[PDB]
Structures are given as C-alpha cells and as structure tokens.
C-alpha cells in the first residue's frame, strides 16, 4: 500500500459539474512528489466553456494522496491502495452558495485516476463568484477527525476578493477507503496546513494550472498531562 | 396546454453518502386541483441504505391550485417549462443538493433529476431508516429579478416521537422569457405530501401531493 | 380565564447589538382571540439606535394569537403564571441575535421583560447600513416538544432597492406552568402579519400592529 | 507594550444558557510571551449548572498569546486603553452562545467583562446531559477588518462513547484605541490548547491551562 504509491506519481482526473444551472465537463493532468506533499496539474474545460463563474470555487476538486505524512502519524490515503479511497464534500459559502462533490479516486498502470461529479447551487447572480471577482484562496488548515473508519474534514477558508477583503467558505469533508478499516491503522486528531495557488490561466480559465503544498501534522505543542 | 388531467415522467441519478442509485415515477394528477400521485421505482442501488423520506420532494410544480388573482409561475412557463435547484440542510448536518429540469414533450410532462447528499450522520435517523414521512409544510416563493426562491422549513417525523428538522432554499427559473410572464408577488404554498404504499423495502413507493397557493389574507 | 377579550401589556426590553447598548419599553393593548395587538414602543435609552430597528420588532406577545375551536392555545392555557420564550435568529449574510423573554401576568396585566444579545452584523449589510422596509407577512411552524413548543420560521426583511434578506427564527417556548395542567397542541401554523404603523425621532419611537391566525393543516389527507 | 513578563487576569462574567441565569469569577496567572496561562474558575451563583461547563471554557484571553518578531501583535499594541471581543458560537446540534467581552488594564492587572446567552441547546444532547470531555487543540485564522480581526475557528468537544461535538467559532476583535497608533497583523493563525487541570464540587471549581501561539502560513509559495 505504501509499496505502491511511488516517489513520483501522476493523476488524471475527469470531472462532471453543474453550478447555478450551467452544466460543464473538464479533465486534468498532474504530478507530484507525494511524500514531499507537492503537486501541479494542468487542467481543461472540454465542455461548457467558458465558465459564466469563478473557477476557483473549482480549485479544490482536482489529490489526497500527495500528503507529506511524518513518521507516526499514519497516511489513511496511501494506506488504503490498491483499492483507493473516496471523498464526499459540502462548500457551504458564507453568501448562500453551496457545493457538494463526490470523488472517486483509485489507481491503474501507476496513474492516479479520479472522478468528480458535483452540484452548486444558490450562489448569488450578483456575488463575487458569479461576478469573477475572486482572486485565489487563502492557505488552509484542515482538521480530520477519525469516524466510523472515515476521517470528516473541516476547513474555515477564505477566498480573496478584488478590492481586498474575503469571500468566507466552510467546508465539510468525509474521506473514506474502500479497503476494510481492519486491513487499515488509523490515525487520531491531526492537522493538514495547505496553500493551492494558481499558476497559469488562459483562455478565459478554461485552461487552468494549478500547484498545491500540503504537509500533515499531530498537534505539536506542550500539554500539561 | 396545462390540462385538468396531466400525466408525468420522471428520471432521476443521484448519490447520498457515496451510494449511487436511480429511480424512474410515473404520475398522474389534477394541475389545477392541485393533487397528484405518482409511483416511484429505484433501478439502480437499490435497497438504498437511507430512508427514501429524504428524496420525497425530489418527485412536480406544475401541479399546486393558484386561484384567479395571484399569477402560475410554473403554468405560464409552458411549452418552454422550468427548472428548479435546491438545497436541503438538515440539523444533523446532512445537505442535499439537486437540479431539475421540467419539459413538456408530446402531451406528457418529464422530469429530470440529478442529486447529490453528503454529511448524513452515521447513526442518523436518515442512515438508520427511522423516519416517518414529512410534516404538512408551508414554503414561501418570492420574486428575485425574473425567478422564484423558495425558502420552507420542513420536519420528518421520527420513530420514538420526535421530529428531523430541515431547512429547503430553492430556486425556481422559467425557460421562457420574462417579459412573457407576469410575475406573482410574494405568495405562500400549503402542501401535505404523504406516503401512499409501500413495497420491497422502499424499491417501490406511492406519493400523493395536494399543494394549494395563496397570497396572504390576513389584513392590513 | 384571565385573558380577557381586551387587555393591555407593558415591555422592558434591554439589549446589545454589536457591543452597542440600548434599552427599550412598551404600551400595547390589544384582543387576544381576534389575534390583534398594537404596542407603542420607546427607544428610552442608547438612541438613536446605529442599526435597523426592524429587527427588534419580533421582540415585542404570543398570548395575542387567535387559536380556532379544537387547537389548544399553550400560551393562554399557561397562566396565571404565563410562559418564557427563547429565540435565535440568523440572518443569511451572518448577523445572529439570541433573545430570552419572560411574560407574566400582574393585575391583569400582561408583562414582558427581555434580554438580547447580537452579534456579528456586517458594517456593510442592510441592517447596519438602515437600508430595511419591515417584514414580510409570514408563518411559524409550532412542534410540540416535552412539555414545551418549537418554533421555526424562515422570514424576510424588504430592502432599500427591492429585493429581501432572509432571517431564519428558531424558538423555544416554555410554559411556567406544569405541562400536565395543560392540553398540549399537536403540530401546527401561525400566519401573521406585522407591520410599522408610525415612527418618529429617528426611529427611537415605533408603534407596530400584528395580526395572528393560528390553524392546524386545512389540506385533505389519505 | 506594557504588558509584563508574568500577568494576572480577574474575572467577571455573567449569562443565562437555555434560562439558567449565572454567574463566574476567575483569578487568572501566565506569561504573555511565551502565551500561557492558568484560570481558577468559579461559579458563584446559580451552582451547579445543568449543562458542561466546557461550553463556557473558551470565555475565560487574547493578551496571552505568543507572537513571533515579525508578526503585529494586535492585542498587546491595543493598551492601555485596550480592547473587546463579540464572538457567535454555533454548536452543530442548535446550541448557539453569543458572548462580549471587555478586556482593559487597571493598575498592574488585566480586568475582563463577559455578558453572554446561550439558547436552544437541545436537551438530551451531550452539553445539557454533561457528556463532554474537553476540547480538541485548535486554530484560529484571524483576517484584518476595518483596523479590527475577524476570528474564524471550527472546534470539536470530546464526547463520552468516543465521538465529537463540532461548534462554528466566529469572533470579532476590536482595539478601544485608534489607527495609526497600531500596525495591523496580516491574515495569521494562532494555535492552541485548552486543558481542564483541576475539578470540584459538580463543576462549580474549575482550574484551565491554554497555550497559545501565533504564526504566519510556514509554507512554500510558488508566486
């Protein structure tokens, strides 16, 4: 399982989506050093381009397993191949949008291979979103928490605005393996700091680039017991 | 077009909690009584491992009884139909997303419904099939430049006495231009939707709807 | 009963909005199973007030509900010892107000004493801003509840400009009196309307009407 | 600023969760440097409370916070006339507080002012059945706002049978003194751990360590 996820891996994704009404496709191609926590992948709208929306409430459907996970905390993600593992989230804006996606990742010939499928709705005509006034989101830290052999995620994030200020977003993960949690050691309450820039756009974001660092970690400081 | 009698058809993919599944109804109804009923089959992912209460709402607009003064946004909307989208929030922390699409092709009226629910806790009235149908409900619709939103707080009754509450924002969006339809005002929806029949562990389910519109008569 | 066609009821009513602090009272009369009240309310101290007094307007009397023949009204039954209720409320663009009342009854008169808190109202939005036109007419959904009532209510504030900002009202209100010498109701709706009648000195004087209907579900069944 | 290697904190709070009026003090002790402290709590009036206790642990100190040289230390800049937080705290079960507070400096000793209320925390959940066991380390992401910070922190309660109780943490802090008499802090996060040390009588003494320790994102940035 750590056997098998290699100090260089590649993902191709596809995606199918609809927000605020207009429905849309797109895939992408990318590549890391997971156990560095690094990544970078170029992706495309092969329908429904362009987008009447910000791609960047997007950013975060396109790769759990490029985690950089220290000794002793154990990786739940990498832990769980050759099988894979799956990821259902809800964005909950502070503006009224809502997101919810459903991942599907597993691996085949040493390629990642995810599938996306999500819904947005009720996001405001005349919002920051529907009105491309995001510039990118802010670092990040998620805390997973173990349930039921799932890890639930939970992230305050913040996307930037034009103008300065912040468009606030939570958001509310469940990450669960498809290998049974008994073949599985499961972590306790950590933490996972991340920052997703964008890299490149074109075309009207229909080609976007993106780069993420995550790095995992237990709670560092003193305790008094 | 809208007639006293009106036949429907329904498709419907989703996910919750990561199980995929299908249905298809067939329905049948008064448009300007307000009543219907239609029979409801999952074909794909079924058992489903939740209580099928939580997808009633997803199988019909066109059949609420709009008296003479307060305008039919669905009913005008036609040939060219509507949409809808909504979220569902649950105080449990489950959220239902889901789209529709409303057609009339060749006399019968044809349903499309794509949704997606995450978050339902484990153990989990919903997860634990210990629902009993939906509360009678009134949603309140208001103009917002050219469509409606729909704003209802909705209660499923629960095996042990208590009540799952659950908070519905929709947004209702005719195909046909604005400028071809008179707009209502703020107006309220009364509906009492009840489970019919039953069979094969909630793979076959009867619904009947009886959904009233009014302004409100209180004075002023 | 001790709640006669015509009574009257007075309110004190202290207050925070963003650390802003402000104490309000009221004379009202009204008719409580016709289900209309008018109070005549007073910004005594703290005004005038850097936010939209339309928020505070729920805070000012449930034993004016007109309740038809065969649905137990909880809030007359109550007394003499009458009822407390405890709110929240949410506003979509992230304003929340916590709200507790007391209501007693003195010389058959009706007494409210509240306490509320809010927090986190956005300097740009219409409430801080004073951009709202009062409430829609609405109706509050009642769920009984160990002994005591559940309400839920989604609402909406008119808005300078024409559109609304929607405010989600979740209450719990309890009954001082023991729950076995009272006919609980099941399930059921109160319609109301509220309204502004007169205002003057920068909204730190306010009269408001409200009419409310109560009903069990009217629609056929089976 | 003025703020001594080794301070005290008194403390007076008091609120109605759910109706049940009461009332708090602490006497309070820690190091503002190296963001720790210690908080004697009791519950003068209105003891014992029929819900956690845990629920209030977060109402009891912004001054005692390690910041790093490099990072605008908001809290210690705003003195003497020093500071406030408005927070909303929304329980994943209904329970939802709304909390003020007054932080100022009075003669060698840090006086805090807390008004709070607490409604529809549902009854047979964990907080009113006193099923909690503490609070999971956090982190706090705090965003300028018009010379003021906008705290934003999702926190999870410990549960008895193992779970978690999730709560929405959204505050406002706000210096009683100007700008510019202040730089401003960019967007930064404060880590953190709150620890029950000592408990007596239903919940009516209560001893609370915290640390807390402020960084900027540590992390490589690609633009």
Redesign the interface.
């Known amino acids: 399982g750590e056997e098998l996820i290699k100090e260089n891996m590649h993902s191709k994704l596809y995606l199918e989506g609809?927000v605020?009404?207009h429905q849309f496709k797109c895939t992408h191609e990318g590549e890391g050093k997971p156990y560095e926590g690094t990544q970078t992948n170029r992706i495309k709208v092969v329908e429904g381009g362009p987008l009447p929306f910000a791609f960047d409430i997007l950013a975060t459907m396109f790769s759990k397993t490029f985690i950089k996970y220290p000794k002793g905390l154990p990786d739940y993600f990498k832990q769980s191949f050759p099988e894979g593992f799956?990821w259902?989230?809800?964005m909950?804006f502070?503006?009224?949008g809502?997101?919810?996606?459903?991942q599907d990742t597993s691996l085949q010939d040493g390629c990642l291979i995810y599938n996306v499928?999500?819904?947005?709705?009720?996001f405001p005509?005349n919002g920051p979103v529907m009105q491309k006034k995001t510039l990118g989101w802010?670092?990040?830290?998620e805390?997973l928490?173990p349930?039921?052999g799932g890890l639930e995620g939970?992230?305050?994030k913040?996307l930037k605005l034009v103008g300065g200020?912040?468009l606030?977003c939570?958001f509310?993960t469940?990450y669960?393996s498809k290998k049974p949690a008994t073949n599985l050691k499961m972590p306790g309450?950590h933490?996972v700091?991340?920052?997703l820039?964008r890299?490149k756009e074109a075309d009207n974001e229909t080609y976007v680039e993106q780069?993420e660092?995550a790095?995992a970690r237990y709670?560092?400081?003193?305790?008094?017991?």
């Open positions: 609809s605020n009404g799956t259902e989230r809800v909950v502070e503006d009224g809502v997101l919810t996606a459903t499928k999500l819904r947005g709705v009720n005509a802010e670092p990040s830290t805390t928490y349930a039921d939970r992230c305050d913040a200020g912040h606030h939570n509310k469940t669960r309450v933490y700091d991340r920052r820039e890299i780069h660092v790095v709670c560092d400081l003193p305790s008094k017991l």
